[PDB]
Amino acid sequence: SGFRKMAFPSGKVEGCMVQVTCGTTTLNGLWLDDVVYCPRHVICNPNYEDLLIRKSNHNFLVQAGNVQLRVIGHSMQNCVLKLKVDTANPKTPKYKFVRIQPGQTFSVLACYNGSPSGVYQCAMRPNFTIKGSFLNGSCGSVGFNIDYDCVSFCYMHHMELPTGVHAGTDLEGNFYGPFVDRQTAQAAGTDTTITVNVLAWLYAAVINGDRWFLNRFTTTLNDFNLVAMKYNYEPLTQDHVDILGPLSAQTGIAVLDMCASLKELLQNGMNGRTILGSALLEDEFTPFDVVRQCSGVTF
Amino acid sequence: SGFRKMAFPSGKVEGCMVQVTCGTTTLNGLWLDDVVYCPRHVICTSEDMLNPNYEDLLIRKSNHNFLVQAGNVQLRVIGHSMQNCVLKLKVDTANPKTPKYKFVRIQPGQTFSVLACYNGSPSGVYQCAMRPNFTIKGSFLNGSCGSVGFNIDYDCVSFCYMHHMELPTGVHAGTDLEGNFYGPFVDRQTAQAAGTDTTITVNVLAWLYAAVINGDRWFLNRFTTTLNDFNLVAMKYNYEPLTQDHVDILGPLSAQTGIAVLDMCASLKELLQNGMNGRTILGSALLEDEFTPFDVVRQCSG
């Protein structure tokens, strides 16, 4: 029993964290095989082609523990800088670079000066920001998932928006959201609740013996989406309904039956009651996270 | 900016997790240098669990009865001894991944990271607090016994907890790494229950200072209180008494924000009276008590 926000074991990613210093700027890099990946703003209206052409390999100081790596090449791919080094990382795990969609969750290994300091779980918000926990020097920290023994790198941290939320890119340097890596007026758009994730967390509550919110009612997918749009909740699709199938079969509560519970919770509140120790509806657990935690999958 | 429940990086502990098998029982072990530490109930069958005599069960075992697996490699057990509720298996190979470590016994209110494992394989990491009733609100299934709680200081791992059992309310009980249980629990299937739990007051105050550092001031008021008047109110909401030690510990946060501890105590009294009125504090509609004053300073300053 129990239900916690749980991150993937971070060890395979810890063995890849390095410090990258160029001029007066210091941030984190991800060392995989003979390449170090880091935000391109380490070289900083910037003209990154013009700023990069003026740099030599010896301008980038890369440090892995107490060992300095020698940079033998450099190239830019979108908003990520790729530093070719002379030595392949012997701790390189089996890995892939994957771009995730809003609502998907991942683990973040927060780093400062190439040293990991913490791990937390979070979700890609529908407005493409992440509600992270980052200070100055956190740039280059990465987001990931683990499948068996393969690390899927999905996020690299780049900046903090004025509301305290964070923006970054996939490992190919493409930003999540309409953000740019430049000091200019930028803001997070109006955010919405990840509906499929709230439903998955309501199934996790049922599996853990929290059932007060259940009711005898059902609803149509159209009627639920009309209600959800009024409460700034993301639309629920047939794909989301299908994904929730296994949890629906395990608890005996049809997805549209759980939608009627969610509709009653949105129109009436919790009334002093809690669900899994929370007075708010949690949306940072996917249906797969719920199945993984309520069955004990290992890495 | 931002405030998350944050666990320590788990890599130094992952390289210590092994699987320990005794007959039909399998659980997790912690391999440090040439010793594997695990709950002593690995020598019990489901039949032995009500009133087991561990000294009598252990004396009947030989080294080859213990099967220890580290990855796809079987370790050879060359000795065994019991220390309180932990079994210590001497092995023929020192773990080359043994980090710098210490065994520390923690007090209620203190937080730690838990690396949840099954069959010697890590499956997840989360952040916990030792509740005032000496239980932890963990997330554990069958076979999680032997999973460990820890903190990291520089490059040193402080092991503070080893998981042993689940009480009937779904909460968990365990020991320090010397086998001494936290709380009045025993490693027997006899009727046991968690005592009435309370809120960790010093931790709620630390989290209110974290909200002030992140720009939230809506809950502050023009009032102060005596330490005694605060405690009289707090006990009525099942909050732990706040001691002068707690007031002193909050000193640095008080100096950084400019809000005296007893002035923040007056905001807490008001929040307990009025509730939040549809508002949240650091994205939460409840008062968070699983962040210590030390966690707040580390996450907000470095």
Ligand SMILES: CNS(=O)(=O)c1ccc2c(NC(=O)[C@]3(OC)CCOc4ccc(Cl)cc43)cncc2c1
């Ligand atoms: C709010 N103060 S803080 O917590 O120390 C902080 C400061 C900077 C943080 C940070 N850095 C940045 O956003 C910038 O990094 C150079 C600052 C200047 O403006 C830009 C513009 C574009 C880009 Cl891509 C980056 C930055 C990242 N993540 C978290 C940060 C927490």
Ligand SMILES: CNS(=O)(=O)c1ccc2c(NC(=O)[C@]3(OC)CCOc4ccc(Cl)cc43)cncc2c1
């Ligand atoms: C509630 N079902 S479950 O989630 O699968 C589960 C089952 C057993 C869990 C478990 N095991 C135990 O508590 C016991 O382990 C042999 C079961 C029998 O009673 C005792 C008595 C004393 C001691 Cl020290 C251990 C046990 C631990 N932690 C979490 C557990 C989740």
Ligand SMILES: [Cl-]
């Ligand atoms: Cl302590």
